[PDB]
Amino acid sequence: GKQYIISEELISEGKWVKLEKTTYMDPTGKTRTWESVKRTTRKEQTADGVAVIPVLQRTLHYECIVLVKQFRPPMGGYCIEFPAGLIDDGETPEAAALRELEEETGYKGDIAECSPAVCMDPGLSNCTIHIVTVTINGDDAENARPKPKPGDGEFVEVISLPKNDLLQRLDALVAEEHLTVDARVYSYALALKHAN
Amino acid sequence: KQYIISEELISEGKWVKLEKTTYMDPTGKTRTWESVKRTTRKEQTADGVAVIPVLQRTLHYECIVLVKQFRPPMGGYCIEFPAGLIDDGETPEAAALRELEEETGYKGDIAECSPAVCMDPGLSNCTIHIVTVTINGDDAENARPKPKPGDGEFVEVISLPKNDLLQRLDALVAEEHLTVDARVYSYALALKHAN
Ligand SMILES: Nc1ncnc2c1[nH]c(=O)n2[C@H]1C[C@H](O)[C@@H](COP(=O)(O)OP(=O)(O)O)O1
Ligand SMILES: Nc1ncnc2c1[nH]c(=O)n2[C@H]1C[C@H](O)[C@@H](COP(=O)(O)OP(=O)(O)O)O1
Ligand SMILES: [Mn+2]
Ligand SMILES: [Mn+2]
Ligand SMILES: [Mn+2]
Ligand SMILES: [Mn+2]
Ligand SMILES: [Mn+2]
């Protein structure tokens, strides 16, 4: 049969992340357990946050994917990721994506498409996001000189990479800089390559 | 310029632990962060692997082999690339082929392998190797794939046309409540965005 959540007991709770004990029934009817992770910041939204796939489009250039580089404490190092952020209450994933993109990179984009809620690491947490594809007219004078404005302690570096050579360019950065590329970013790059 | 200063254990379970991370920001200011780690870490190249299995048969569309299973943290079923932990002394490529065979019964060949990539850098230190594996669906070996599941592992196999992956993923989501993995969806998106 199907599997069902029986109960969810809180183990420990921080200000942002909480650890839980999940009791559930497997197909055979046997009671199993699991140690699940959940954020405390989510309330009544469609997902925790969004990830933005910013496609920089310019008349004189190949399409580029705008990525960001920042220090991630949980990783204890710098990571290369799609721009990403939380969805504000009453805010749509699309609106969150456009704002987040501008805040982190300074680019002003347009919605190309928006995904349903997708899971970040189902074996670990309940964390989900909306993947929002956003196009940026790099030729518009407004996007000629992108000027971001991070919040308090963000410190974000912007890195644009050619769509037609994304994977190789990511590999280079990993070897030279000792960075860690995001799994979504790399999955994206792999498909671009496999499609040719 | 930024680095880790210290880490204080907040709560450790048998599988997962939560801790407070103090680090130095670019200004020289001290800040903290709540980070998640699996209670099992070592001198590996990554925590585990995720396999992108490309089922190839002559005169047929390529298919992407995915797995569907109940995920307690999500409290529901998810669609993911086959995945699992890497064993001691085992290469990422080796764990991929083994993991794929265990979950799908398919015996494939290594196409390429990524460096260690982060699963959710804003939350945890979890990393994996994304391994692209081609499966000769015409070879006798792969005529009748026999999955060899471990205890407590209940995995359903799904093969979707690579040429129409995104749309087929949506069709599944439309049929019933389930969540597509972000890595799988990112892959499906790029297939459409390509040139
Ligand atoms: N009770 C538990 N609580 C939390 N994590 C657990 C767990 N039991 C358990 O195995 N894990 C870990 C093990 C894995 O890191 C992960 C399960 O996801 P995967 O990698 O697809 O599983 P795999 O195929 O079995 O190796 O959760
Ligand atoms: N001290 C802390 N510990 C843990 N998580 C934290 C945190 N402070 C904090 O903001 N978070 C959460 C908030 C978010 O879930 C995430 C911050 O990173 P992102 O995804 O890029 O979000 P953004 O900064 O809003 O754009 O971690
Ligand atoms: Mn951010
Ligand atoms: Mn934000
Ligand atoms: Mn941000
Ligand atoms: Mn698995
Ligand atoms: Mn497994």
Phi-psi region of A3 (alpha: psi -120 to 50; beta: other; left: phi over 0): beta
**CB of A53 shorter than 6 A to ligand 2:** no
Any chain B CB within 8 A of the CB of A3?
yes
Instruction: Please check whether the domain covering B1-195 is classified as CATH 3.40.640.10.
Output: no
Q: Find the helix packing angle between A183-195 and A166-177, rounded to 10°.
A: 140
Compute chain A's Rg from CA coordinates: 19
* Dihedral class, residue B105 (left if φ above 0, else alpha if ψ from -120 to 50, else beta): left
Q: Specify the residue with its C-alpha closest to ligand 1, atom 24.
A: B84
d(C-alpha B51, C-alpha A55), whole Å: 27
The two structure tokens encoding residue A153: 């302690």
Q: Cβ(A50)–Cβ(A96) under 8 Å?
A: yes
Q: Which amino acid is at A163?
A: K
SS (H, E, C) A136-194: EECCCHHHHCCCCCCCCCCCCEEEEEEHHHHHHHHHHHHHHHCCEEEHHHHHHHHHHHH
Q: Could you give the angle at the alpha carbon of A73 between the alpha carbons of A67 and A75, nearest 5°?
A: 70
Nearest CA to ligand 2 atom 8: B33
Q: Which residues pair with A56 in a beta bridge?
A: A64, A136
- For domain A1-196, which architecture applies? Alpha-Beta Complex (3.90)
- CA-nearest residue of chain B to A18? B18
3-state secondary structure of A101: helix
DSSP letter assigned to residue A22: E
Q: Which value, to the nearest 10 degrees, does the dihedral of the CA atoms of residues A118, A122, A126, A132 take? A: -20
Q: Which residues of A are annotated as a binding site for Mg(2+)?
A: 84, 100, 104, 154
Report the alpha-carbon distance of residue A131 to residue A97 in Å, rounded: 9
* Residues in contact with A153: Cβ distance below 8 Å, sequence separation at least 6, in sequence order: B25, B29, B31
C-alpha A105/C-alpha A97 separation (Å) is 12
Q: Which contiguous run of DSSP H or E holds residue A30?
A: none
B42 residue type, one letter: K
What is the amino acid identity at position B133?
A: V
Please tell me if residue A183 touches chain B, with a CB cutoff of 8 Å.
yes
Q: What are phi and psi of A171, to 5 degrees?
A: -55, -45
Give me the amino acid identity at B32: T
Enumerate residues preceding breaks in chain A (C to N > 2.5 Å).
none
Question: Rounded to the nearest whole angstrom, what is the distance from the C-alpha of residue B122 to the centroid of ligand 2?
Answer: 6
Q: Can you give A81-92 as a three-state secondary structure string?
A: ECCEEECCCCCC
Instruction: Give the CA distances from residue A37 to residues A127, A146, B15, B19, B145, in Å, rounded to whole numbers and listed in that order.
Output: 8, 37, 11, 13, 34
CB B130 within 8 A of CB B86: no
The rounded distance, in Å, linking the Cα atoms of A19 and A2 is 25
Closest CA to B104 of B125, B70, B80, B72: B80
Residue B107 CB-density burial (10 A; 0-12 exposed, 13-18 middle, 19+ buried)? middle
Which one, of B138, B112, B136, lies nearest residue B55 by Cα?
Answer: B136
CA distances, A70 to each of B21, B46, B132, B137, B161 (Å): 16, 20, 27, 42, 36
Distance between CA A53 and CA A134 in Å, rounded?
Answer: 6
d(C-alpha A17, C-alpha B40), whole Å: 19
Residues of A within the annotated binding site for substrate? 16, 34-35, 39, 72, 86, 121
3-state secondary structure chain B: CCEEEEEEEEEECCCEEEEEEEEECCCCCEEEEEEEEECCCCCCCCCEEEEEEEEECCCCCCEEEEEEEEECCCCEEEEECCEEECCCCCCHHHHHHHHHHHHHCCCCEEEEEEEEEECCCCCECCEEEEEEEEEECCCHHHCCCCCCCCCCCCCEEEEEEHHHHHHHHHHHHHHCCCEEEHHHHHHHHHHHHCC
Phi first, then psi, for residue B128 (nearest 5°) are: -145, 165
Resolution to 1 decimal place, in Å: 2.0
Q: From CA B68, how far away is CA B162, in angstroms rounded?
A: 17
Q: Please say whether the dihedral angle defined by the alpha carbons of residues A144, A145, A149 and A150, taken in this order, is positive or negative.
A: positive
Burial class (CB in 10 A: 0-12, 13-18, 19+), B169: buried
Nearest of A37, A27, A31, A28 to residue A6 by alpha carbon: A31
The span from the CA of A75 to the CA of B122, in Å, is 8
By C-alpha distance, which of B55, B56, B51 is closest to B67? Answer: B51
The Cα A43–Cα A39 span in angstroms is 10
Per the CB < 8 A criterion, the answer to whether A16 and A27 are in contact is no
Q: Which of B70, B19, B63 has the alpha carbon at shortest distance from B188?
A: B63
Smallest Cβ distance to A190: which of B33, B130, B173?
Answer: B130
At residue A17, the 3 state secondary structure works out as strand
- The DSSP element (H or E) to which A9 belongs, if any, is strand A4-13
